[PDB]
Structures are given as C-alpha cells and as structure tokens.
C-alpha cells in the first residue's frame, strides 16, 4: 500500500521541478533528524562547526514508515531554506522555491492523513459550539501617511522561511500585518444581477 | 494586437485580463485581482478571466468571443465597427453579422 | 457613487534600491486601501464541518486548510504524468 505511495511522489516531484531544478541542487548527507522548528538553527550550527534528494531514493534512503517520510519533509525544508537564503528576495528563483515549498508541503501534509469574554459568556450560555480550527501564515504590507491620503502597499513576496531582519528603504515607512478574511462565502447574487439589460 | 490598460493602476496586462460585468468597460491584471484592489462596490464574482492572445484559425468562435459579441450587442444595438473591435478587432463586420444571424 | 476615482498613487522620490519584491509600475504603486488575503479559492460545499446536518460541544483540530479546498489525490497525478509520455 505504501509501495506506490513513494513512486507517485517521486514522479510528481520530478516533473514539477523542471523550471527551477530544485531536485538537482547539491545536498550532502546532513544528519539532523531534529525538531523542524530548529531546522535552520541546526544548519546554522552546522555552518559554524564545519547524495542529493534525487539520489536518496535511488539509494533507498526512505522506508515505508513514518520516519521514511519525515526525513523527506526534512530534506525538502532544508533545501528550500538554502535556496531562499542563496538568492535575493526579488529574483524569480526565490519565488519558484517558495511556491514549490508550498505545493510540496501541502502535498505531504495530506495523504499521510489518509494513511474570558462577555460575548462568550452570552453565547456559550445561549448556544452549542461544534467547531474547527487551523493555522495560516499572515503577510505584511507597508504604510504611509501623506497629506490626507493615507496610502497602502502591495503584499511583500518575502517567504515564510526567510528569517532575515526587516530592512526598510525609508524610515518614514511603517509595516502592518494583513489578517486574512475567511468564513462561509457571503451568498453571492444570482446571474440576473450580473448582466441585466442596460 | 490591442493593448489592455489595467484599471485602478496604469499597468499593462500581460496575457490574461479580468473583465468586469457591471461597469462593462474595465479590465484588471492578475495581481490586482488576487489582492482585491478593484474597489468595495464590486464583489469578485463579476470578473471573468478573459485572454488577450490571438486565437486559432478563424471560424472557430470560442466562448470568449461569443460572450464579447453578445456584450457588444447589448452595449451598442447597432454600429458593427464598435462591435467588431469589442470582439477583439481581428474579425470583420461582415463575419460578425454572419455569425449573429 | 462614482467609479472613475484614481485609487493608486506614486511618490516622487525614487526609493528603488531595496524594492524588487513589491509591485512596481514599469516606481512603487501605493494604493488607497490594503490587500485582501484569501486562503483557498474553491469552497468545499458538502463536508459536515460546513454543511451542518440536522442529526446527532465538540472540537476538532483538522490538519491545515487543505481539507476545505478540493485537492486531487496523487495517484491520479502520477497516472496523468504517465499518460503524458
């Protein structure tokens, strides 16, 4: 059952890597096997102290177990942090590695799943809560006060794995976080509203 | 080949515009539509992904061209030059009338 | 209610030194409101997390937002890449 489950990920992650060549990047052994939140600080310590991802499958480095995919996730996150720190923040091979990390992390999170407030004091008294919760990463925009116009910026394409200090082309800039809006879509109008007789 | 100035900014759309169906004479880029820079009156349902590239050999009549033809007929009620450019300008008057009949 | 307002602005000072990541005109475009971040475009219309059937206080920490977004399974994608060549 786990036989084809590596073969398909192999084929997909090969064919979705043509324009950026992430898989054929150089990568030595790098035995960490650590907490994935430590995955850059551990490689920082590996830089301070002192076989690529395609060749890992050809040598059979991954078993049909939980660790046999945890190592694959670990290797992808390492190569993506390396390729983020290697390029500047505006090049196309920065954004391709960011998109490839997003796609592959989404592909590897699923299919291993197959395999204090007065308003709350009113509502938890009045209703019954069946629920659902999840995590998303937010992003940033800039902020400027001109003469009575009070502008905004676009979304910075800085990835979630950048870790750099926040540089600013102006000190009269400000920075803000954009909370994503998410809920049951508000009932859209019918097609009689969209395209009536004018 | 025409050029499609993106509304709400000054940019040029590359090969995909987002046509609005209630002002009916505006467009957008992809990035101004991903982030929602099109004003709080519109609701991101009334924006159809239209293309800009030259299509295949003629008398195919893709659904984009049929839709823009019917948009033009609802706009102008006459004036088949102003219909044939709104289709895209790569079709003649004498073929738009032969296709609407 | 007008339509033809400008709603984008450009400052005169060329600060184009550390700005290759933002949206440039080709300067820097400065809009009159923020952006809108949308998690997933396609709603998953069934799924009793969302449909709420009328039969039978509980919490559930689902993995990611990707449950609510119609993702294809990988065996079809490998089948289609095999059909590619």
């Amino acid at each position: 059952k786990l036989v084809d489950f590596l073969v398909n990920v192999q084929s997909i992650l090969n064919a979705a890597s043509v324009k950026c060549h992430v898989v054929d990047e150089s990568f030595p052994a790098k035995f960490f096997e650590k907490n994935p939140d430590k995955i850059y600080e551990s490689y920082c310590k590996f830089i301070k102290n002192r076989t690529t991802i395609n060749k890992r499958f050809e040598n059979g480095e991954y078993e049909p177990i939980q660790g046999g995919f945890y190592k694959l996730y670990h290797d992808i996150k390492l190569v993506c942090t390396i390729l983020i720190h290697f390029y500047p923040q505006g090049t196309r091979n920065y954004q391709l590695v960011d998109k490839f990390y997003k796609f592959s992390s989404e592909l590897l999170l699923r299919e291993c799943c197959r395999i204090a407030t007065e308003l709350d004091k009113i509502i938890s008294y009045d209703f019954i809560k069946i629920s659902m919760n999840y995590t998303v990463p937010i992003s940033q925009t800039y902020q400027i006060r001109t003469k009575d116009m009070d502008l905004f910026s676009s979304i910075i394409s800085k990835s979630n794995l950048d870790k750099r200090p926040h540089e600013l082309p102006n000190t009269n800039f400000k920075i803000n976080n954009v909370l994503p809006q998410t809920d049951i879509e508000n009932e859209a109008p019918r097609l009689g509203f969209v395209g009536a007789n004018t | 080949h025409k050029v499609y100035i993106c509304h709400t900014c000054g940019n040029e759309s590359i090969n995909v515009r987002y046509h609005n169906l209630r002002a009916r004479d505006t467009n957008l880029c992809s990035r101004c539509f991903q982030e929602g820079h099109f004003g709080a009156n519109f609701q991101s349902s009334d924006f159809i992904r239209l293309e800009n590239n030259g299509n295949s050999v003629k008398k195919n009549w893709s659904d984009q061209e049929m839709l823009l033809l019917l948009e033009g007929i609802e706009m102008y009620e006459d004036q088949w030059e102003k219909i044939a450019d709104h289709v895209g300008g790569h079709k003649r008057v004498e073929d738009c009338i032969e296709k609407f009949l | 209610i007008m339509i033809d307002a400008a709603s984008s602005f450009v400052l005169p000072i060329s600060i184009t030194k550390n700005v290759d990541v933002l949206q440039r005109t080709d300067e820097i475009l400065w809009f009159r409101g923020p952006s809108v971040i949308v998690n997933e475009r396609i709603i998953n219309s069934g799924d009793p997390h969302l449909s709420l059937p009328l039969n039978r206080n509980e919490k559930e920490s689902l993995p990611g937002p990707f449950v609510l977004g119609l993702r294809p399974s990988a065996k079809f994608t490998a089948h289609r890449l095999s059909m590619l060549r």
Binding site: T146, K147, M149, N172 | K2, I5, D25, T26, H86 | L11
Partner: peptide, 29 residues
C-alpha cells in the same frame, strides 16, 4: 515627509478598453 502630496494615476476609461498597437497603409503620399 508628511507634506508630500502624491500623484494620482488616472485611467481614462477609453484608454483602458480597446486601444490598438498613418503611412504604413500605403495609400497616402
């Protein structure tokens, strides 16, 4: 910096819709 009135980019609706991209039709010398 707070006295730095910004420049509006006007769209001019007829430019946004259908602008094409005259001696190159040889009938006019």
């Amino acid at each position: 910096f707070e006295t730095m009135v910004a420049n509006p980019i006007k769209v001019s609706r007829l430019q946004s819709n259908g602008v094409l991209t005259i001696h190159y039709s040889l009938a006019n010398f």
